[PDB]
Amino acid sequence: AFLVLDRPEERITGINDPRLRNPSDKFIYATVKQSSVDIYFRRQVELST
Amino acid sequence: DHLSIVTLEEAPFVIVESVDPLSGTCMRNTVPCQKRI
């Protein structure tokens, strides 16, 4: 039971989880400046936070 | 019509935050709320 259920700290899903959808100081996520990712999040109005 | 509305500060329900200093206006989809001191 210990060896089977010894789950890791899991991972992060796409851009939907609260761990990433709303920021926290400890968490740091970023992309490359002046790229398509930059003008994908900037263009969207829901992904302004 | 125009009417006054009161709001407290709760965690997921109403989150208050300071205005953006780089422009003087806060983000979109975030209505202003005056605070008295």
From Swiss-Prot, chain A:
Modification(s) after translation: NMDA is probably regulated by C-terminal phosphorylation of an isoform of GRIN1 by PKC. Its phosphorylated state is influenced by the formation of the NMDAR-PPP2CB complex and the NMDAR channel activity.
Binding site for glycine: 36
Impact when changing residue 1 to G: Increase in glutamate and glycine agonist potency; mutant channels are activated lower glutamate and glycine concentrations
Glycan-bearing residues: 22
Entry's localization field: Cell membrane; Postsynaptic cell membrane; Postsynaptic density membrane; Synaptic cell membrane
Consequence recorded when altering residue 10 to K: In NDHMSD; this mutation produces a significant increase in NMDA receptor-induced calcium currents; excessive calcium influx through NMDA receptor could lead to excitotoxic neuronal cell damage
Quaternary context: Heterotetramer; the NMDAR subunits are modular and harbor tiered domains that function in concert to regulate opening and closing of the cation-selective ion channel pore. Forms heterotetrameric channels composed of two GluN1/zeta subunits (GRIN1), and two identical GluN2/epsilon subunits (GRIN2A, GRIN2B, GRIN2C or GRIN2D) or GluN3 subunits (GRIN3A or GRIN3B) (in vitro). Can also form heterotetrameric channels that contain at least two GluN1 subunits and at least two different GluN2 subunits (or a combination of one GluN2 and one GluN3 subunits) (in vitro).
Written domain comment of the UniProt record: A hydrophobic region that gives rise to the prediction of a transmembrane span does not cross the membrane, but is part of a discontinuously helical region that dips into the membrane and is probably part of the pore and of the selectivity filter. The extracellular N-terminal domain (NTD) is a site of allosteric regulation to modulate overall receptor function.
Family listed: Belongs to the glutamate-gated ion channel (TC 1.A.10.1) family. NR1/GRIN1 subfamily.
Function statement: Component of N-methyl-D-aspartate (NMDA) receptors (NMDARs) that function as heterotetrameric, ligand-gated cation channels with high calcium permeability and voltage-dependent block by Mg(2+). NMDARs participate in synaptic plasticity for learning and memory formation by contributing to the long-term potentiation (LTP). Channel activation requires binding of the neurotransmitter L-glutamate to the GluN2 subunit, glycine or D-serine binding to the GluN1 subunit, plus membrane depolarization to eliminate channel inhibition by Mg(2+).
Protein name: Glutamate receptor ionotropic, NMDA 1
Organism encoding this protein: Homo sapiens (Human)
Gene name as annotated: GRIN1
Section of the entire sequence shown: 653 to 701 of 938
Swiss-Prot record, chain B:
Source domain of life: Eukaryota
Tissue spec: Primarily found in the fronto-parieto-temporal cortex and hippocampus pyramidal cells, lower expression in the basal ganglia.
Compartments where located: Cell membrane; Postsynaptic cell membrane; Cell projection, Dendrite; Late endosome
Annotated phenotype, changing residue 10 to G: In MRD6; decreased protein abundance; decreased localization to the cell membrane; changed glutamate-gated calcium ion channel activity characterized by decreased glutamate potency
PTM per Swiss-Prot/TrEMBL: Phosphorylated on tyrosine residues.
Disease link: Intellectual developmental disorder, autosomal dominant 6, with or without seizures: A disorder characterized by significantly below average general intellectual functioning associated with impairments in adaptive behavior and manifested during the developmental period. MRD6 additional features may include seizures, hypotonia, abnormal movements, such as dystonia, and autistic features.
Protein's job: Component of N-methyl-D-aspartate (NMDA) receptors (NMDARs) that function as heterotetrameric, ligand-gated cation channels with high calcium permeability and voltage-dependent block by Mg(2+). Participates in synaptic plasticity for learning and memory formation by contributing to the long-term depression (LTD) of hippocampus membrane currents. Channel activation requires binding of the neurotransmitter L-glutamate to the GluN2 subunit, glycine or D-serine binding to the GluN1 subunit, plus membrane depolarization to eliminate channel inhibition by Mg(2+).
Self-association state and partner proteins as the record states: Heterotetramer. Forms heterotetrameric channels composed of two GluN1/zeta subunits (GRIN1), and two identical GluN2/epsilon subunits (GRIN2A, GRIN2B, GRIN2C or GRIN2D) or GluN3 subunits (GRIN3A or GRIN3B) (in vitro). Can also form heterotetrameric channels that contain at least two GluN1 subunits and at least two different GluN2 subunits (or a combination of one GluN2 and one GluN3 subunits) (in vitro). In vivo, the subunit composition may depend on the expression levels of the different subunits. Found in a complex with GRIN1 and GRIN3B. Found in a complex with GRIN1, GRIN3A and PPP2CB.
Record remark on domains: The extracellular N-terminal domain (NTD) endows NMDARs with a unique capacity for allosteric modulation, harboring several binding sites for small molecule ligands that act as subunit-specific allosteric modulators of ion channel activity. A hydrophobic region that gives rise to the prediction of a transmembrane span does not cross the membrane, but is part of a discontinuously helical region that dips into the membrane and is probably part of the pore and of the selectivity filter.
Span within the parent record: 404 to 440 of 1484
